């Protein structure tokens with residue numbers, strides 16, 4: 621439940637939220653899994669966190685969401701078992717690739733990467749599961765360009781500049797957050813839509829520039845205030861080179877001031893799986 625002695629620890633994949641991730645083998649030999657083990661200096665608070673993350677992840681059962689295939693909690697040290705995504709982090713995976721002239725990635729593949737995120741996000745919406753932190757950095761690539769949405773938290777020093785940090789406040793992925801999250805702390809499905817819009821811009825940017833990169837933290841926060849004000853002073857992410865106008869129009873709708881005028885993930889999937897092909 622699941623037998624801990626069946627796990628064979630092979631490499632360190634990265635750090636992790638409450639300890640390290642290991643690539644493991646299961647003889648059931650190279651049936652590969654990822655194993656997150658609770659750090660050995662891990663405080664009572666991190667253990668609680670780890671156990672909650674276990675419960676949250678047990679809910680998530682979709683091809684395009686990370687799967688908890690197993691757990692080793694019933695004895696110390698605490699362990700979490702997921703699929704292994706061989707290409708790792710989607711932001712770092714895309715960062716290497718260049719758009720196909722006329723590692724490469726083509727435009728229809730960028731659509732397929734996006735549609736897999738639209739599908740997994742559609743799944744979460746049916747659970748009324750609010751992600752709160754959709755971005756390429758929380759996505760994993762397992763090939764054949766198979767995308768799993770995950771959540772690595774907000775503490776890793778690689779993506780430090782992606783979060784806005786105030787002493788004693790919640791850590792805020794502001795460049796991905798809908799105006800109403802920024803001003804009110806209101807995370808919904810509709811704000812997940814907004815972040816998908818930004819994630820979709822990231823994919824189409826091949827993860828080569830930060831959303832509102834040339835703007836400061838403050839400026840992103842006051843841009844949210846420009847959305848509330850509704851005076852036509854709100855500034856949007858520009859069209860990525862790899863992005864047509866038809867598709868960019870869909871990114872824009874994602875950032876509609878009115879949450880209910882943002883497209884449901886069902887429509888974002890229909891667009892990226894069907895309409896973006898024509």
Ligand SMILES: Cc1ccc(CNC(=O)Nc2cccc(F)c2)cc1NC(=O)c1cnc2ccccn12
Pocket residue numbers: 633634641654655656673676677680685686700701702703704705706707708709751760769770771772
């Ligand atoms: C083993 C493990 C445990 C916990 C996590 C991160 N928890 C989540 O994603 N929770 C979560 C919460 C809410 C919504 C949601 F959608 C998700 C991830 C992993 N697995 C890896 O880290 C891994 C797998 N393949 C590779 C390849 C390279 C590097 C890392 N990995």
